[PDB]
Amino acid sequence: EAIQRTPKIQVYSRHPAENGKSNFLNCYVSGFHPSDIEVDLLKNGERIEKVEHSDLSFSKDWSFYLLYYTEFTPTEKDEYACRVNHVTLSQPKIVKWDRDM
Amino acid sequence: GSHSMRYFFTSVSRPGRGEPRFIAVGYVDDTQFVRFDSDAASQRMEPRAPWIEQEGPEYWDQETRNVKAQSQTDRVDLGTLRGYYNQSEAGSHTIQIMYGCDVGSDGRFLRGYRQDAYDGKDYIALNEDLRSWTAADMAAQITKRKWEAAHEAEQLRAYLDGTCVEWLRRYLENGKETLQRTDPPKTHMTHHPISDHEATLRCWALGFYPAEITLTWQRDGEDQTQDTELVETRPAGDGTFQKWAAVVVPSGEEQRYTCHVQHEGLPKPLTLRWELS
Amino acid sequence: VVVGAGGVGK
């Protein structure tokens, strides 16, 4: 794998988040190579254990994409994040869920 | 109003850790319907859309057998291209393949395609005439000579403009309620101050299908393409897609910027301007 | 459906 591409991580919800209404927390990893990657969803800094993911596919430029998701009820207290580890990263990168992005 | 069927394959060698990882996915338009993972429990081609589940046991037998055969060739090709590129047996490498066909709204054939990659770079691709190949480098030209001698294009073309087109027609009929939909984008605009003099304008597009969309920023009618942040189109998880594009503007000049949205399901291209008191 | 088996190697 001479060409190595850093993953670009997006954290978002399936529907517009409303506190108290069940939703889906998504972590979309894309643009990375090679395909070996570790993705975890965090609630208040701890790993959420029942997390599904998509079947590996790639884009026009050959770079891979994966969607990790889990059901959640947004609160104005709990903090949610995505943790991604790849060969292109010095340390597992954590992107926090922002209802603005 | 055109449709497509596409199959994506990925083979990743695992030296000293057994057979390569093989993942195959089939999609009709932006809807996945089939899956094969060599690390999955079943070792069969599995349904991933409700309208394909009605297929019989013989359909899944043939899909399992043929997709496994793809895996065997990819396993061989990993060793072969390791020689072509003079690389060690210790490293892990990747082969990716995409092929499929496109039909118009009346079902007529439009285009066929097959593209192969090695370690994330182009290796060999079939041309639009489905009669000739384009190799990416001199290593890939060895493959091109082999496929030209065995006449692989003629055999593949019969699938790309024949079998592929007919089964794409059947899938579109078997899942018309879900596959023949065009969800137009739900659009809105957000505003985020980064200071007391600058703010981020973000243009949103949510809940649209299919996935192709265009978001463009314009200042006073002129484009701002090199000052625009635009993230990858992302799936919502319910079958629809999301995207946004952002621009940093001087506070009080937000009315000078407009976001332009283009999508298959839009009657006219949408124009969004931030509103102020 | 995927292509039938029988493609030659690279």
Residue numbers in the entry:
A (entry chain B): 19 to 119
B (entry chain A): 1 to 277
C (entry chain C): 1 to 10
Sentences from the paper on this structure:
MANAs are HLA-presented (pHLA) peptides derived from intracellular mutant proteins that are otherwise inaccessible to antibody-based therapeutics. The most common KRAS mutations occur at codon 12, where the wild-type glycine residue is mutated to a valine (G12V), cysteine (G12C) or aspartate (G12D) residue.
We determined the structure of the KRASWT 7–16 peptide bound to HLA-A*03:01, using X-ray crystallography to shed light on the specificity of the V2-Fab for KRASG12V. The majority of the amino acids making up the KRASWT peptide (V7VVGAGGVGK16) are small, hydrophobic residues, where the sidechains cannot make electrostatic or hydrogen bonding interactions. Therefore, most of the available hydrogen bonding interactions with the HLA-A*03:01 were with the backbone of the KRASWT peptide. In total, 10 hydrogen bonds and one electrostatic interaction were made between the KRASWT peptide and HLA-A*03:01.
